[PDB]
Amino acid sequence: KCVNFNFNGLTGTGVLTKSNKKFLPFQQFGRDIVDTTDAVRDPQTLEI
Amino acid sequence: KVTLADAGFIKQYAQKFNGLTVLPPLLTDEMIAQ
Numbered sequence A: 001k002c003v004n005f006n007f008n009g010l011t012g013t014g015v016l017t018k019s020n021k022k023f024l025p026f027q028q029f030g031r032d033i034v035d036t037t038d039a040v041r042d043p044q045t046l047e048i
Numbered sequence B: 001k002v003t004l005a006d007a008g009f010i011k012q013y014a015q016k017f018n019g020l021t022v023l024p025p026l027l028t029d030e031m032i033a034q
């Protein structure tokens, strides 16, 4: 659903979906080729 | 031979970057071929 979100201080508006990206154990969020956030790690479940 | 380098999201119609919209041409490739 289109929601507003705040993940451990990272804020924005968007639709959250299950991701197939595999983050390293320490990484909390990701960015695309133009440095705009496009993925987050849920701080409670660690799902990407 | 000609390829695209548009670093966005592609859908049949990220999808529009951050307020940046790409419009289709009026004449499609088939119409130009015609």
Ligand SMILES: *[C@@H]1O[C@H](CO)[C@@H](O[C@@H]2O[C@H](CO)[C@@H](O)[C@H](O)[C@H]2NC(C)=O)[C@H](O)[C@H]1NC(C)=O
Pocket (backbone or CB within 6 Å): A043, A044, A045, A046
């Ligand atoms: C604290 O975080 C942990 C994981 O980082 C949560 O543990 C999981 O919670 C889900 C849903 O509550 C359960 O289905 C899992 O089985 C839990 N995992 C384990 C290993 O127990 C935990 O629930 C979080 N606590 C709170 C209060 O949110």
Ligand SMILES: *[C@@H]1O[C@H](CO)[C@@H](O)[C@H](O)[C@H]1NC(C)=O
Pocket (backbone or CB within 6 Å): B011, B012, B013
């Ligand atoms: C629009 O979305 C629906 C979702 O079920 C899909 O079946 C359909 O093909 C989509 N059409 C276009 C033009 O994107």
